[PDB]
């Protein structure tokens, strides 16, 4: 034993226990989801209201990369911010050299390689976040989810955090009941519902809903936050479904 004391050490299983311990930090975090729709993607996240003293709508969790990519994550919030800062540098250098905005699969690997690099040495710690991200590019809509190991895949729907099992079950129903696809405005409504349903795992403290989206028709392929009437419409739809 002692194989779990240092990062980048293979155990006799062939496992990196330090990365597996980073996953525990992710599982401890709040719920966040992603939904791939007809011509874009929708992101949503659970924000726990620790106290009345928290200013509503101010502590924003979802982050934009470039102008067409959205990023949300569960786990250690600072680690997620560090990853997004890197993502922004990666996207900037891509656009600098190649002119076109970075494609989503291309962007996904840039994060993947960077996270994977933090499993190669004992002088660094793995990332304590699973990141759900995506957007619209020349080839259409893309949704991805990236783990502490550096592992990522494309997704129809994605979920992580403390209420991931509840969310995953809800996402699986949508995939089955909508083979032809889901619209952007529908996805926002469904996203709200799923976060509310996933909140049963964090039911002690009340929460604040935060949604964003990229859509070719609704947002011209740019990342925007869901605000005002459209946000309230999604909250009402979500509240109606739980009752």
């Amino acid at each position: 034993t002692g194989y779990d004391l240092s990062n980048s050490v293979f155990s006799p299983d062939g496992r990196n226990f330090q990365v597996e311990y980073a996953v525990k930090a992710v599982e401890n975090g709040t719920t966040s989801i992603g939904i791939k729709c007809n011509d874009g993607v929708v992101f949503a996240v659970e924000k726990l209201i620790t106290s009345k003293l928290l200013v509503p709508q101010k502590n924003v969790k979802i982050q934009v990369v470039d102008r067409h990519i959205g990023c949300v994550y569960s786990g250690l919030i600072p680690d997620g911010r560090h990853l997004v800062n890197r993502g922004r540098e990666e996207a900037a250098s891509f656009k600098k050299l190649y002119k076109t905005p970075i494609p989503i699969p291309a962007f996904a690997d840039r994060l993947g390689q960077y996270v994977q690099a933090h499993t190669l040495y004992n002088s660094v710690r793995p990332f304590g976040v699973s990141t759900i991200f995506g957007g619209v590019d020349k080839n259409g809509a893309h949704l991805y989810m990236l783990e502490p190991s550096g592992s990522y895949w494309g997704y129809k729907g994605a979920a992580t955090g403390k209420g991931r099992q509840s969310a995953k079950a809800e996402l699986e129903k949508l995939v089955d009941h909508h083979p032809e696809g889901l619209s952007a405005r529908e996805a926002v409504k469904q996203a709200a519902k799923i976060i509310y349903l996933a909140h049963e795992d964090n039911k002690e403290k009340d929460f604040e809903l935060e949604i964003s989206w990229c859509s070719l028709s609704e947002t011209n392929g740019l990342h925007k936050f869901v605000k005002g009437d459209l946000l309230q419409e999604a909250i009402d739809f979500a509240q109606k479904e739980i009752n």
Binding site: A117, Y121, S123, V124
Partner: protein, 250 residues
């Protein structure tokens, strides 16, 4: 990041032993048998092509390697370590010698350079020793034919004949009885094949044995004509057919 292993991973123990070097020698002991014999007019080096799978093409894996036109090398121990050493050995023969003096280094000095590289892996920061022992056969104008052994420590010794790896203890005894100072090259090849048969279990033929010589100059292998002083490489790898011909007269 940064390589933060700037300290030695090989250190003296209370008994005065250098553990990592001893353990590297143990890895060499497990390795497949290889040998070298020196004749009056040449040198022979040989080893078994231990194929990991019958689907694998064992011709693509070269255990016996040309370092210079007149110097060859064979090993016992960890194959990957050997492969990188051959790369470095080839390069150092150019950078530290040929690009300075306009000619290939003599056997002993190339061996000295390889030995240096292996010593540094025994003392430098954040590295383990090489897990191989090399046998380097070669020829040069002023020293003639020569055969050297190089160990993980960086120590090297000249030999009339020797063996390393799996069945080296038995093979060295076999060579002591057969070796004399009047051997011709063909006689040394014959003795090499006899010695190597003892350590091999399965098939024993040109396809499972790798054998090369340092002998006469080969103008046919030079690739060009017109310069009298350039007479061709003394290193030659024996073909599968050439080995089988000598196995009939065995």
């Amino acid at each position: 990041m940064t390589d933060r292993y700037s300290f030695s991973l090989t250190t003296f123990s209370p008994s005065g032993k250098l553990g990592q070097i001893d353990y590297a020698l143990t890895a060499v002991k497990q390795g497949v048998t290889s040998l070298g014999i020196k004749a009056t007019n040449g040198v022979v080096i040989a080893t078994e092509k231990k194929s990991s799978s019958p689907l694998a093409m064992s011709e693509t894996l070269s255990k016996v390697s040309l370092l210079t036109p007149d110097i060859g090398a064979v090993y016992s121990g960890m194959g990957p370590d050997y492969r990188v050493l051959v790369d470095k050995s080839r390069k150092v023969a150019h950078t530290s010698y040929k690009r300075i003096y306009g000619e290939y280094p003599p056997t002993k000095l190339l061996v000295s350079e390889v030995a240096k590289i292996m010593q540094e892996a025994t003392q430098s920061g954040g590295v383990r020793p090489f897990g191989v022992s090399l046998l380097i056969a070669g020829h040069d104008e002023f020293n003639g034919f020569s055969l050297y052994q190089v160990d993980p420590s960086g120590s090297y010794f000249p030999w009339k004949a020797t063996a390393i790896g799996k069945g080296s203890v038995a093979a060295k005894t076999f060579l002591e009885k057969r070796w004399n100072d009047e051997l011709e090259l063909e006689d040394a090849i014959h003795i090499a094949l006899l010695t190597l048969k003892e350590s091999v279990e399965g098939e024993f033929n040109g396809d499972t044995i790798e054998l090369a010589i340092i002998g006469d100059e080969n103008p046919d292998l030079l690739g060009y004509t017109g310069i009298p002083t350039d007479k061709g490489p003394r290193f030659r790898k024996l073909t599968s057919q050439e080995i089988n011909d000598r196995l009939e007269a065995l």
